[PDB]
Ligand binder design. Structure first.
Ligand SMILES: CC(C)(COP(=O)(O)OP(=O)(O)OC[C@H]1O[C@@H](n2cnc3c(N)ncnc32)[C@H](O)[C@@H]1OP(=O)(O)O)[C@@H](O)C(=O)NCCC(=O)NCCS
Ligand SMILES: CC(C)(COP(=O)(O)OP(=O)(O)OC[C@H]1O[C@@H](n2cnc3c(N)ncnc32)[C@H](O)[C@@H]1OP(=O)(O)O)[C@@H](O)C(=O)NCCC(=O)NCCS
Ligand SMILES: CC(C)(COP(=O)(O)OP(=O)(O)OC[C@H]1O[C@@H](n2cnc3c(N)ncnc32)[C@H](O)[C@@H]1OP(=O)(O)O)[C@@H](O)C(=O)NCCC(=O)NCCS
Ligand SMILES: CC(C)(COP(=O)(O)OP(=O)(O)OC[C@H]1O[C@@H](n2cnc3c(N)ncnc32)[C@H](O)[C@@H]1OP(=O)(O)O)[C@@H](O)C(=O)NCCC(=O)NCCS
Ligand SMILES: [Cl-]
Ligand SMILES: [Cl-]
Ligand SMILES: [Cl-]
Ligand SMILES: [Cl-]
Ligand SMILES: [K+]
Ligand SMILES: [K+]
Ligand SMILES: [K+]
Ligand SMILES: [K+]
Lengths: 393, 393, 391, 391
């Protein structure tokens, strides 16, 4: 009737700090950030590097990164030349989809240990020029962040304008979004001060010929705020009756996250103690413009599949693509906002698009208390979302 | 214990013709070719579009294609907005890896029907300019085909130069390579004129305003050859004792392929006759320069895994990245040349890189006789290969 | 010293090539070399006699260092020859001749070459120095940016023409009739062999290809009279007058004159073609450049006490059909004496070359004793004019 | 008519800014307007008296149509003022003065402005028109392609300087000593207030930021004498001599002079600063440009019948320290009379401007009755020189 599958466990979840656009980590390619997160995750797992059998990494903006970004990140982390690698693109959901797909390989018994995560260096995303002849009168070379990353293909508008569309329908006003945003910055600061990212974040040292070293040991974005200015900001994506601003939207960022995943049997063989069990996951899709609400349906799928209720979830991570998205999800699901993005999120910590889906699973892994269920969901351009249920061990 | 998995069958396999670089299909983006193949596959399968639950497309050079290439391809094929999509990058192995990952989802019982394949428009791959301050003395605009597609990161040389290195190691000379190349063109012409791609390839109508419609109904590349010229050509990747020429290497091309995959149970439910069973698959990786021999190890893994012998394979599809690669594989596996790439391959038909791993699997599906085993393998930049074993139903 | 008299000893040019057309493979400086060599040959003097060279050239971006020096050295003139490149927009080729004449008048040199050169086919695009702006980078076309856009008004030259069409009531049908007349006159002149002494052929050499000899202007054949009244108004969509047919085109070409003092011409026993009588620049409100040649022409006439009736042949550069009509309207001159063998609307307009071409054409076409007046407008509101008398 | 006497009535310049430095937000034409307006104000004449303007400007790409016209109209001069932009590479700013003097000598104008302008900070990159080559392309830097690369040898100006250093045995240490000397002289002259009638300040305004007043040259402070002997030889790896310290730098600036006939100065009740006595251009093999100024200077001296000893001060443009040393050696002049208040190695070298700056500096620094001689080399193998006498 129903397939009998291997049990999948998370043994470590590690990330770089998230750097701001053109900021602290901007000199480092996405693949280098990948290598740093992958090397960190293997160290934290306490396993040999040779034990990693295969690697999948989310990475949305691959233009100009060179051949096989995941291979670059893996070989860059000192893993064996024998390690197969695949780079995954589900827009903002990439980092999560990588984990899901790796989980599926493990469930099939096709590998026993894998690394999965995401990486993005938005600072280093290039501009493009069409192949062919230059038209008389000039041409604008397009920005790949905008063209590939942030523009809905079908509506020919920015992700922000799609968010405005949801704001309208669900009556989610500027003040509520601004309040959510301030709250995210508040929670991010609290968490960092309380040392809530001790085992999760590893520092990166930026070495430049001549000048002194810079050690980046925390997320850069959450300190770039002025609470007084927040309600004074102009709406960036919609002038007429807008709600979304630079403050209450996610930002553009650099970072990478990696998880060591293995079967239950593998963890025993290697004598390592798992952090959490990956229970179920799902993808959902809606009209491209309606992506902010796709996480609702994805989350519900996962709950229905396992036969749990929203109340059974101790901790939710709903990616803060826009403050609007989180509020849209809180509204439709009817869940306790005190249980949502408790230690901050993409609005204040930043959103390296290919890594965020991995980061939020990594964070549940650490923050959950033994036995608790954690649910992470993440929307994506095109009308998609991914969700994942884990249980702490 | 080994998991108990669902059985996966191929119900249809369809592709566009392969267009030459800046040739017959150069006006169509990769995603549009994707839509044509996906629509083709579904119609050929004789199922409602709504039965397709999820889609994975291989696509190596995603820059400038717009957000979520697979979503574009899927929605462009008129599939429901409810259909989740993911774009896969394992370089030249992408089209096969997409099928593999879709198979793992089916095996897990996570979906019952999926579309998997590959797409590439090398004609439309753009040039790139780095973000940042313009360096004194000049700004480089790099060709993404060269930078992301064809250049080994680690050795900093063309794929063709890596091939030369294997030609050296295994003493595969210019004459043998040229002979293989002529053989490939010969087989392609024969197969095309015999009507052998009658159920595999669907024609493409190119429409230009004011111009007469062009119907591309067959592969463009195989007619672009002069056998007398073959031995005369210069070895374009190496000065001292070269072997690889434009004639005996694959070309740059445009095309897409798509397969409808389902569980044995779903095929029964939908009352469709499955074409083949997907038995096993594997990824192998070696030293980046040695990618030409990676398919040897991947095929060997698959054979060892299923407990089959090389002699048990009725038809081999070893992707013709370079004539060199096929010869190296024949050499190491000690297989019958007459059973390899029987109706031509990438040297004569062209190599839209994200598509080819899907095409060759689709070709075995149509070409195998009832009960026969077919093995498809494909190398990728970085030092990898994927391989798949199917059995005709 | 007293001021020296200046004579034109030779005047030569390449054919004019269409945009991305027959001469598009040759850089402007190479066209310049061809013209300069040809003029020296026609003058019948040793190259060593040429003391200094000035060339008009408007769009110098990407041509490499010192375009006039490249033209001169490329024509095999002595390394001792000083060179200067001149930019008065479309007036450049005439202003080079004027400034050369002044040097000769001062006794500072006795023999010079002056002319102009342009390869609009090879003018590049530009990217600004600095940081790439988020959201995209603009690559501007230097033809449009440096060549054809008025700085002050932020409009195309073609829109300045429309402005004059309004103020002087010069209609679309009138501009179209002028353009058709220009194409007619160019074809008639070419058929009659009127350019046999003025134009020298250019051989275009490509590796692995057979040589192509370009012996005549390309542009004047690119016309369909039936289509002329049907064309869209490209610079002003609504109630416009200027079109692709009735405007000058973008083109490649070079022209060069050998100039000497009367004393040097005698010393070298060459037969001068014409004497330079007077020249002048005028400038007006930037948008009103179409009428600047009227003032420039008036200045030269007044300078030497001649009346408009004393001019046998007028060359009023055909930047637009509108410009010539405006000049005829304001000066009230006989249209049958204006641009008699065609002009820039039909022959094309390599912008730095045209002001030299039209002086050179008068030098060949005028009959002994006749006066010719050449005038040419330029972006920014300028014009230059020159009066010569055929010897 | 006989040749008219030419006088310099004012000479003014912006400070020179470093590459991407204090004046980098201003286009060349705006620096031009500032210098022109300053020169006219200092002259004390109605601006309407200025009849025509020539400005040197080497790297014109992307500056928009008719750079000199933009500078002149931006300075508030009348729309009736004709304008021409001059390109003789680094000699441009001097050649503009020479050409304007020739017009005045002919009596073709009685008052002109002449000078030079350059914003190397704003010089763009270029992409060729046409289809993009498979495998990509490098967009060239116009400073490098048009400004600093010799066409014929396909090497940097700096490598041409190396050739002369080798031929004349002018060593690394001698070049460094000259460069330190220039920096020392520049600082001392700035500290003594020697530029108070020459340089006018520039206020740089950014909406949202406070005003920055640029009141002195930026470059001469960017030096560390202890480092000078440690620098790499950036144009030549083996046996090199030229470095960043002992070569001129890339810079932004403009200079403008008001020139009149002696009659016009009398008419307008103006007391001129200096008389323009003579000028000349010389040219040699392109690679040998460093020595062209020797020949240009010798021409002027021989023309007027002066000997080197009759010259009170020499301004030999400091394109490289090597150039000045080659000139001092070949001419056998007293080094204490050469570039007395610094030069391009330490003040910087906005290439279209420097030839005018050095003439303006002599006009201010010479004492009554003294002769000053300015000379300047240019890419392609040229030089210009000019002799003035202080009144
Ligand atoms: C919104 C976006 C375009 C940034 O806008 P921006 O205008 O270039 O951002 P800026 O840094 O110029 O900020 C604009 C203003 O907001 C202010 N601001 C920004 N963040 C702030 C904060 N946290 N608190 C207070 N003020 C803030 C700035 O000070 C600035 O004020 P100013 O106009 O007086 O100078 C970009 O971050 C974006 O597109 N984000 C969404 C990313 C996305 O869509 N991801 C995928 C999800 S589907
Ligand atoms: C080989 C490659 C660099 C193109 O080289 P190219 O020299 O620009 O190819 P061209 O079309 O200019 O062909 C060169 C010559 O070969 C000839 N030629 C090419 N294919 C031929 C054939 N099949 N039969 C006869 N002659 C042929 C052409 O006529 C041409 O001759 P010419 O010099 O008289 O014009 C490019 O196609 C490539 O990189 N291929 C490999 C792709 C790859 O690496 N894929 C991934 C695998 S890991
Ligand atoms: C006018 C200009 C913008 C060209 O415009 P364009 O629309 O790209 O010109 P095209 O070549 O595409 O011609 C457009 C149409 O006119 C037609 N056409 C052009 N010249 C024609 C002629 N002489 N007779 C008949 N038809 C003609 C073309 O066939 C084309 O027809 P189509 O739309 O059915 O295909 C350009 O030549 C220009 O800027 N000229 C002015 C140059 C200038 O200002 N110089 C300085 C003077 S101050
Ligand atoms: C020389 C040139 C290429 C600049 O070279 P650069 O290497 O990019 O110059 P930089 O500013 O990076 O200086 C390099 C080094 O020299 C040092 N330096 C430069 N000028 C110095 C000075 N005056 N004193 C001490 N040190 C100095 C810098 O500190 C730097 O040292 P670092 O490597 O420890 O940081 C450029 O200025 C040039 O082309 N000049 C010639 C212009 C020209 O040819 N004009 C026309 C004449 S015909
Ligand atoms: Cl999706
Ligand atoms: Cl791999
Ligand atoms: Cl010169
Ligand atoms: Cl003017
Ligand atoms: K924010
Ligand atoms: K081939
Ligand atoms: K025309
Ligand atoms: K210096």
């Amino acid at each position: 009737s129903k397939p009998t599958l291997k049990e999948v466990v998370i043994v470590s979840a590690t990330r770089t700090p998230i750097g701001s656009f053109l900021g602290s980590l901007s000199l480092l390619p996405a693949t280098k950030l990948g290598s740093i997160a992958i090397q960190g995750a293997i160290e934290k797992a306490g396993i040999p590097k040779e034990e990693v059998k295969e690697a999948y990494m989310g990475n949305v903006l691959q233009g100009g990164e060179g051949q096989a970004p995941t291979r670059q990140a893996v070989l860059g982390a000192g893993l064996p030349i024998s390690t197969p690698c695949t780079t995954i693109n589900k827009v903002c959901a990439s980092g999560m989809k990588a984990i899901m797909m790796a989980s599926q390989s493990l469930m099939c018994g096709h590998q026993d240990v894998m690394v999965a995560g995401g990486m993005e260096s938005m600072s280093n995303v290039p501009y493009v020029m069409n192949r062919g002849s230059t038209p008389y009168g000039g041409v604008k070379l397009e920005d790949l962040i905008v063209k590939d990353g942030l523009t809905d293909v079908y509506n020919k508008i920015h992700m922000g304008s799609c968010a405005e569309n949801t704001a309208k329908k669900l009556n989610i006003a500027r003040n509520e979004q601004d309040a959510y945003a301030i709250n995210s910055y508040t929670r991010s600061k609290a968490a960092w001060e309380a040392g809530k990212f001790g085992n999760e974040v590893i520092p990166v040292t930026v070495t430049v010929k001549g000048q002194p070293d810079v050690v980046v040991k925390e997320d850069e974005e959450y300190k770039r705020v002025d609470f007084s200015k927040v309600p004074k900001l102009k709406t960036v994506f919609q002038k007429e009756n807008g709600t979304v601003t630079a403050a209450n939207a996610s930002t553009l960022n650099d970072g990478a996250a990696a998880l060591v995943l293995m079967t239950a049997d593998a963890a025993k063989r290697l004598n390592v103690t798992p952090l959490a069990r990956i229970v179920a996951f799902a993808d959902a899709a809606v009209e491209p413009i309606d992506f902010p609400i796709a996480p609702v349906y994805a989350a519900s799928m996962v709950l229905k599949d396992v036969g749990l209720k929203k109340e059974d979830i101790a901790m939710w991570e709903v990616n803060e693509a826009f403050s609007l998205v989180v509020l849209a999800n809180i509204k439709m699901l009817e869940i306790d906002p005190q249980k949502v993005n408790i230690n901050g999120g993409a609005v204040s910590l930043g959103h390296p698009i290919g890594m965020s889906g991995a980061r939020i699973v990594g964070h549940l892994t650490h923050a959950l208390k033994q036995g608790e269920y954690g649910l992470a969901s993440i929307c994506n351009g095109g009308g998609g979302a991914s969700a994942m249920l884990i249980q702490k061990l």
